[PDB]
Amino acid sequence: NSELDYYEKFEEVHGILMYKDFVKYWDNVEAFQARPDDLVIATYPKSGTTWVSEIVYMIYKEGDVEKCKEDVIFNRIPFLECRKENLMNGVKQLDEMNSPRIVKTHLPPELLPASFWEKDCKIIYLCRNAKDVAVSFYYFFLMVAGHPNPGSFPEFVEKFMQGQVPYGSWYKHVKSWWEKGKSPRVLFLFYEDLKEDIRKEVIKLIHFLERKPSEELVDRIIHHTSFQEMKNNPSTNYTTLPDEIMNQKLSPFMRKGITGDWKNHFTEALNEKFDKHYEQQMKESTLKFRTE
Numbered sequence: 404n405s406e407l408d409y410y411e412k413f414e415e416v417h418g419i420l421m422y423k424d425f426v427k428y429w430d431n432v433e434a435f436q437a438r439p440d441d442l443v444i445a446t447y448p449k450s451g452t453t454w455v456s457e458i459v460y461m462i463y464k465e466g467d468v469e470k471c472k473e474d475v476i477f478n479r480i481p482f483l484e485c486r487k488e489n490l491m492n493g494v495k496q497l498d499e500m501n502s503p504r505i506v507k508t509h510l511p512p513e514l515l516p517a518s519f520w521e522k523d524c525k526i527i528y529l530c531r532n533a534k535d536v537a538v539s540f541y542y543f544f545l546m547v548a549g550h551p552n553p554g555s556f557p558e559f560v561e562k563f564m565q566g567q568v569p570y571g572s573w574y575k576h577v578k579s580w581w582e583k584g585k586s587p588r589v590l591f592l593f594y595e596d597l598k599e600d601i602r603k604e605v606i607k608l609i610h611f612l613e614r615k616p617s618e619e620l621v622d623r624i625i626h627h628t629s630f631q632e633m634k635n636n637p638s639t640n641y642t643t644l645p646d647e648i649m650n651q652k653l654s655p656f657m658r659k660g661i662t663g664d665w666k667n668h669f670t671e672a673l674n675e676k677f678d679k680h681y682e683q684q685m686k687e688s689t690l691k692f693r694t695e
Protein backbone atom coordinates (compact mmCIF):
# COMPACT_ATOMS: atom_id res chain seq x y z
CA ASN A 404 0.00 0.00 0.00
CA SER A 405 2.80 2.38 0.85
CA GLU A 406 4.82 0.24 -1.57
CA LEU A 407 1.89 0.35 -3.98
CA ASP A 408 1.86 4.14 -3.62
CA TYR A 409 5.56 4.37 -4.51
CA TYR A 410 4.97 2.02 -7.44
CA GLU A 411 2.30 4.34 -8.87
CA LYS A 412 4.33 7.55 -8.43
CA PHE A 413 7.87 6.55 -9.33
CA GLU A 414 9.75 4.39 -11.80
CA GLU A 415 13.42 3.91 -12.62
CA VAL A 416 15.46 5.50 -15.37
CA HIS A 417 19.06 4.31 -15.75
CA GLY A 418 18.63 2.60 -12.39
CA ILE A 419 17.56 5.83 -10.65
CA LEU A 420 14.07 6.23 -9.15
CA MET A 421 12.28 9.14 -10.85
CA TYR A 422 8.99 11.03 -11.05
CA LYS A 423 6.90 9.07 -13.54
CA ASP A 424 5.86 12.24 -15.42
CA PHE A 425 9.53 12.92 -16.22
CA VAL A 426 10.34 9.38 -17.36
CA LYS A 427 7.66 9.36 -20.06
CA TYR A 428 9.65 11.91 -22.08
CA TRP A 429 13.18 10.93 -21.05
CA ASP A 430 14.38 10.65 -24.67
CA ASN A 431 14.07 14.46 -24.85
CA VAL A 432 16.41 14.72 -21.87
CA GLU A 433 18.81 12.11 -23.20
CA ALA A 434 19.06 13.91 -26.57
CA PHE A 435 19.24 17.41 -25.10
CA GLN A 436 21.65 19.68 -26.95
CA ALA A 437 23.87 21.82 -24.75
CA ARG A 438 25.62 25.03 -25.80
CA PRO A 439 29.23 25.70 -24.71
CA ASP A 440 28.18 28.69 -22.59
CA ASP A 441 25.43 26.80 -20.73
CA LEU A 442 25.87 26.76 -16.97
CA VAL A 443 24.46 23.78 -15.08
CA ILE A 444 23.32 24.01 -11.49
CA ALA A 445 23.08 20.47 -10.13
CA THR A 446 21.86 19.36 -6.72
CA TYR A 447 20.30 16.51 -4.89
CA PRO A 448 16.76 17.69 -4.12
CA LYS A 449 16.18 20.06 -1.15
CA SER A 450 19.86 21.06 -0.88
CA GLY A 451 19.38 24.78 -1.57
CA THR A 452 18.95 24.74 -5.37
CA THR A 453 16.66 27.76 -5.38
CA TRP A 454 19.10 29.71 -3.20
CA VAL A 455 22.19 29.21 -5.34
CA SER A 456 20.13 29.62 -8.53
CA GLU A 457 19.07 33.13 -7.48
CA ILE A 458 22.65 34.02 -6.49
CA VAL A 459 23.81 32.91 -9.95
CA TYR A 460 21.01 34.75 -11.71
CA MET A 461 21.91 37.95 -9.85
CA ILE A 462 25.56 37.55 -10.89
CA TYR A 463 24.43 37.14 -14.53
CA LYS A 464 22.35 40.30 -14.27
CA GLU A 465 25.09 42.26 -12.47
CA GLY A 466 22.80 42.47 -9.43
CA ASP A 467 19.82 44.05 -11.19
CA VAL A 468 16.99 43.02 -8.89
CA GLU A 469 14.27 44.13 -11.32
CA LYS A 470 15.65 41.81 -14.01
CA CYS A 471 15.54 38.98 -11.47
CA LYS A 472 11.86 39.60 -10.68
CA GLU A 473 10.61 39.85 -14.28
CA ASP A 474 9.52 36.21 -14.37
CA VAL A 475 9.38 33.33 -11.88
CA ILE A 476 12.56 31.40 -11.13
CA PHE A 477 11.38 28.19 -12.82
CA ASN A 478 10.91 30.17 -16.03
CA ARG A 479 14.17 32.12 -15.69
CA ILE A 480 16.16 28.95 -14.92
CA PRO A 481 14.46 25.96 -16.54
CA PHE A 482 14.31 22.63 -14.71
CA LEU A 483 16.00 20.35 -17.31
CA GLU A 484 14.39 16.94 -16.85
CA CYS A 485 11.05 18.24 -15.54
CA ARG A 486 7.82 17.69 -17.50
CA LYS A 487 4.27 18.74 -16.39
CA GLU A 488 1.48 19.29 -18.99
CA ASN A 489 1.51 23.04 -19.58
CA LEU A 490 3.38 24.48 -16.60
CA MET A 491 6.81 22.91 -17.09
CA ASN A 492 8.81 21.44 -19.91
CA GLY A 493 12.46 22.08 -19.19
CA VAL A 494 13.79 20.85 -22.53
CA LYS A 495 11.30 22.97 -24.47
CA GLN A 496 11.96 26.01 -22.31
CA LEU A 497 15.73 25.62 -22.72
CA ASP A 498 15.53 25.03 -26.50
CA GLU A 499 13.69 28.36 -27.00
CA MET A 500 15.84 30.24 -24.54
CA ASN A 501 18.44 32.70 -25.74
CA SER A 502 21.91 32.06 -24.41
CA PRO A 503 23.49 32.27 -21.97
CA ARG A 504 21.36 29.56 -20.42
CA ILE A 505 21.30 28.56 -16.76
CA VAL A 506 20.14 24.95 -16.43
CA LYS A 507 18.74 23.43 -13.23
CA THR A 508 18.91 19.66 -12.71
CA HIS A 509 18.83 17.15 -9.88
CA LEU A 510 20.52 14.41 -11.91
CA PRO A 511 23.45 12.30 -10.73
CA PRO A 512 26.41 12.95 -13.03
CA GLU A 513 25.95 9.58 -14.74
CA LEU A 514 22.54 10.75 -15.97
CA LEU A 515 23.47 14.27 -17.05
CA PRO A 516 22.89 14.49 -20.81
CA ALA A 517 26.10 13.70 -22.70
CA SER A 518 26.07 16.98 -24.59
CA PHE A 519 26.91 18.91 -21.41
CA TRP A 520 30.08 16.83 -20.90
CA GLU A 521 30.96 17.00 -24.59
CA LYS A 522 30.74 20.78 -24.65
CA ASP A 523 32.65 21.07 -21.35
CA CYS A 524 29.94 23.24 -19.76
CA LYS A 525 30.64 24.75 -16.36
CA ILE A 526 28.75 23.08 -13.55
CA ILE A 527 27.98 24.30 -10.04
CA TYR A 528 27.13 21.49 -7.63
CA LEU A 529 25.60 22.25 -4.26
CA CYS A 530 25.10 19.77 -1.46
CA ARG A 531 23.72 19.81 2.06
CA ASN A 532 24.08 17.44 5.02
CA ALA A 533 21.89 14.35 4.57
CA LYS A 534 19.87 14.71 7.77
CA ASP A 535 18.66 18.22 6.92
CA VAL A 536 18.02 17.13 3.33
CA ALA A 537 15.88 14.28 4.67
CA VAL A 538 13.78 16.68 6.77
CA SER A 539 13.28 19.10 3.89
CA PHE A 540 12.46 16.26 1.47
CA TYR A 541 9.91 14.81 3.91
CA TYR A 542 7.87 18.02 3.99
CA PHE A 543 8.29 18.29 0.23
CA PHE A 544 6.63 14.85 -0.14
CA LEU A 545 3.79 16.05 2.07
CA MET A 546 3.04 19.26 0.20
CA VAL A 547 3.98 18.65 -3.45
CA ALA A 548 1.87 16.66 -5.94
CA GLY A 549 3.38 13.53 -7.49
CA HIS A 550 4.52 12.00 -4.21
CA PRO A 551 3.18 9.06 -2.27
CA ASN A 552 2.23 9.49 1.38
CA PRO A 553 5.67 9.44 3.04
CA GLY A 554 4.16 8.00 6.21
CA SER A 555 5.93 8.82 9.47
CA PHE A 556 9.31 10.54 9.47
CA PRO A 557 11.13 7.37 10.64
CA GLU A 558 9.46 5.44 7.79
CA PHE A 559 10.54 8.10 5.29
CA VAL A 560 14.09 8.12 6.64
CA GLU A 561 14.23 4.37 6.08
CA LYS A 562 13.37 4.93 2.37
CA PHE A 563 15.93 7.76 2.24
CA MET A 564 18.74 5.60 3.63
CA GLN A 565 17.93 2.99 0.96
CA GLY A 566 17.82 5.58 -1.83
CA GLN A 567 14.21 4.66 -2.52
CA VAL A 568 13.18 8.25 -3.23
CA PRO A 569 13.28 10.27 -6.48
CA TYR A 570 16.82 10.85 -7.76
CA GLY A 571 17.99 7.83 -5.81
CA SER A 572 20.66 7.54 -3.13
CA TRP A 573 21.82 10.86 -1.68
CA TYR A 574 25.04 9.03 -0.73
CA LYS A 575 25.91 8.03 -4.28
CA HIS A 576 24.78 11.40 -5.63
CA VAL A 577 27.09 13.55 -3.50
CA LYS A 578 30.00 11.08 -3.77
CA SER A 579 29.79 10.92 -7.57
CA TRP A 580 29.58 14.70 -7.93
CA TRP A 581 32.47 15.07 -5.46
CA GLU A 582 34.66 13.11 -7.90
CA LYS A 583 33.50 15.39 -10.74
CA GLY A 584 34.17 18.40 -8.54
CA LYS A 585 37.88 17.81 -8.98
CA SER A 586 37.57 19.08 -12.56
CA PRO A 587 38.25 22.80 -12.90
CA ARG A 588 34.92 23.17 -14.73
CA VAL A 589 32.92 21.94 -11.71
CA LEU A 590 32.49 24.13 -8.60
CA PHE A 591 31.52 22.07 -5.53
CA LEU A 592 29.65 23.95 -2.78
CA PHE A 593 28.05 23.20 0.62
CA TYR A 594 24.78 24.66 1.91
CA GLU A 595 26.31 24.94 5.36
CA ASP A 596 29.15 27.07 3.91
CA LEU A 597 26.56 29.42 2.36
CA LYS A 598 24.91 29.68 5.82
CA GLU A 599 28.20 30.25 7.66
CA ASP A 600 29.81 32.85 5.40
CA ILE A 601 27.60 33.92 2.53
CA ARG A 602 30.01 36.64 1.40
CA LYS A 603 32.87 34.16 0.99
CA GLU A 604 30.74 31.83 -1.14
CA VAL A 605 29.25 34.61 -3.30
CA ILE A 606 32.74 35.96 -4.07
CA LYS A 607 33.84 32.42 -4.94
CA LEU A 608 30.87 32.14 -7.29
CA ILE A 609 31.59 35.48 -8.98
CA HIS A 610 35.20 34.47 -9.71
CA PHE A 611 34.15 31.03 -10.97
CA LEU A 612 31.75 32.73 -13.35
CA GLU A 613 34.51 35.09 -14.55
CA ARG A 614 32.84 38.32 -13.45
CA LYS A 615 34.04 41.21 -11.27
CA PRO A 616 33.29 41.17 -7.51
CA SER A 617 32.51 44.74 -6.37
CA GLU A 618 31.33 45.43 -2.82
CA GLU A 619 28.06 46.90 -4.11
CA LEU A 620 27.27 43.88 -6.28
CA VAL A 621 28.17 41.50 -3.48
CA ASP A 622 26.03 43.45 -0.98
CA ARG A 623 23.04 43.47 -3.36
CA ILE A 624 23.29 39.69 -3.86
CA ILE A 625 23.62 39.00 -0.13
CA HIS A 626 20.47 40.82 0.90
CA HIS A 627 18.43 39.85 -2.18
CA THR A 628 19.19 36.14 -1.64
CA SER A 629 18.73 36.06 2.14
CA PHE A 630 16.09 33.59 3.33
CA GLN A 631 13.71 36.29 4.61
CA GLU A 632 13.74 38.06 1.24
CA MET A 633 13.41 34.94 -0.88
CA LYS A 634 10.59 33.67 1.34
CA ASN A 635 8.51 36.73 0.54
CA ASN A 636 9.55 37.04 -3.09
CA PRO A 637 6.85 35.45 -5.32
CA SER A 638 9.44 35.05 -8.09
CA THR A 639 11.41 32.63 -5.90
CA ASN A 640 9.01 31.07 -3.37
CA TYR A 641 6.88 29.00 -5.78
CA THR A 642 3.65 30.57 -4.51
CA THR A 643 2.45 31.33 -8.05
CA LEU A 644 1.98 27.58 -8.32
CA PRO A 645 -1.58 26.41 -7.54
CA ASP A 646 -2.29 24.49 -4.29
CA GLU A 647 -2.98 21.26 -6.18
CA ILE A 648 0.67 21.27 -7.29
CA MET A 649 2.33 22.76 -4.21
CA ASN A 650 0.06 23.10 -1.18
CA GLN A 651 2.09 25.65 0.72
CA LYS A 652 -0.58 25.88 3.42
CA LEU A 653 0.63 22.44 4.52
CA SER A 654 4.28 23.40 4.29
CA PRO A 655 5.88 26.37 2.53
CA PHE A 656 8.66 25.86 -0.02
CA MET A 657 10.77 28.38 1.89
CA ARG A 658 10.26 26.42 5.10
CA LYS A 659 12.89 27.27 7.73
CA GLY A 660 16.16 27.80 5.91
CA ILE A 661 18.47 26.70 8.70
CA THR A 662 21.18 24.13 9.29
CA GLY A 663 20.28 21.67 12.04
CA ASP A 664 16.52 21.21 11.73
CA TRP A 665 17.32 17.50 11.88
CA LYS A 666 17.68 17.97 15.65
CA ASN A 667 13.96 18.75 15.80
CA HIS A 668 13.01 15.59 13.91
CA PHE A 669 15.37 12.68 14.51
CA THR A 670 14.77 10.72 17.71
CA GLU A 671 17.76 9.41 19.58
CA ALA A 672 17.16 5.89 18.22
CA LEU A 673 16.67 7.09 14.64
CA ASN A 674 19.76 9.26 14.88
CA GLU A 675 21.81 6.27 16.07
CA LYS A 676 20.49 4.06 13.26
CA PHE A 677 21.07 6.79 10.65
CA ASP A 678 24.58 7.68 11.86
CA LYS A 679 25.77 4.08 11.79
CA HIS A 680 24.41 3.54 8.26
CA TYR A 681 25.88 6.87 7.14
CA GLU A 682 29.37 5.92 8.30
CA GLN A 683 29.17 2.70 6.30
CA GLN A 684 28.08 4.58 3.17
CA MET A 685 30.55 7.43 3.49
CA LYS A 686 33.70 6.12 5.20
CA GLU A 687 35.59 5.63 1.92
CA SER A 688 35.06 9.25 0.91
CA THR A 689 37.15 12.33 1.56
CA LEU A 690 33.92 14.33 1.30
CA LYS A 691 33.01 15.68 4.75
CA PHE A 692 29.77 17.37 5.86
CA ARG A 693 28.80 19.50 8.83
CA THR A 694 25.49 18.89 10.63
CA GLU A 695 25.83 22.08 12.70
Ligand SMILES: Nc1ncnc2c1ncn2[C@@H]1O[C@H](COP(=O)(O)O)[C@@H](OP(=O)(O)O)[C@H]1O
Nearest residue numbers: 449450451452453454539628629630658659660
Ligand atom coordinates in the same frame (compact mmCIF):
# COMPACT_ATOMS: atom_id res chain seq x y z
N1 LIG B 1 17.87 32.10 0.65
C1 LIG B 1 17.85 30.87 1.36
N2 LIG B 1 18.61 30.75 2.55
C2 LIG B 1 18.63 29.56 3.32
N3 LIG B 1 17.88 28.43 2.91
C3 LIG B 1 17.09 28.48 1.73
C4 LIG B 1 17.04 29.71 0.91
N4 LIG B 1 16.17 29.44 -0.18
C5 LIG B 1 15.69 28.09 -0.05
N5 LIG B 1 16.25 27.52 1.12
C6 LIG B 1 16.05 26.22 1.65
O1 LIG B 1 16.47 25.24 0.77
C7 LIG B 1 15.56 24.19 0.84
C8 LIG B 1 14.93 24.04 -0.51
O2 LIG B 1 15.92 23.57 -1.35
P1 LIG B 1 15.74 23.39 -2.90
O3 LIG B 1 15.72 24.79 -3.56
O4 LIG B 1 16.97 22.59 -3.42
O5 LIG B 1 14.44 22.64 -3.23
C9 LIG B 1 14.57 24.50 1.92
O6 LIG B 1 15.08 24.05 3.12
P2 LIG B 1 14.22 23.73 4.42
O7 LIG B 1 13.00 22.86 4.04
O8 LIG B 1 15.10 23.03 5.47
O9 LIG B 1 13.74 25.12 4.97
C10 LIG B 1 14.60 25.98 1.87
O10 LIG B 1 14.11 26.58 3.01
Ligand SMILES: C[C@]12CC[C@@H]3c4ccc(O)cc4CC[C@H]3[C@@H]1CC[C@@H]2O
Nearest residue numbers: 422424452485486487547548549648
Ligand atom coordinates in the same frame (compact mmCIF):
# COMPACT_ATOMS: atom_id res chain seq x y z
C1 LIG C 1 6.46 18.55 -11.57
C2 LIG C 1 5.86 18.61 -10.16
C3 LIG C 1 5.93 20.04 -9.65
C4 LIG C 1 7.40 20.46 -9.51
C5 LIG C 1 8.12 19.52 -8.55
C6 LIG C 1 9.52 19.95 -8.25
C7 LIG C 1 9.86 21.30 -8.18
C8 LIG C 1 11.16 21.68 -7.86
C9 LIG C 1 12.15 20.72 -7.62
O1 LIG C 1 13.42 21.09 -7.33
C10 LIG C 1 11.85 19.37 -7.68
C11 LIG C 1 10.57 18.95 -7.99
C12 LIG C 1 10.29 17.48 -8.05
C13 LIG C 1 8.80 17.19 -8.10
C14 LIG C 1 8.09 18.09 -9.09
C15 LIG C 1 6.62 17.70 -9.22
C16 LIG C 1 6.26 16.28 -9.67
C17 LIG C 1 4.82 16.43 -10.19
C18 LIG C 1 4.50 17.93 -10.16
O2 LIG C 1 3.70 18.31 -11.28
Ligand code: NA
Nearest residue numbers: 584585586589
Ligand atom coordinates in the same frame (compact mmCIF):
# COMPACT_ATOMS: atom_id res chain seq x y z
NA1 NA D 1 36.46 21.87 -9.39
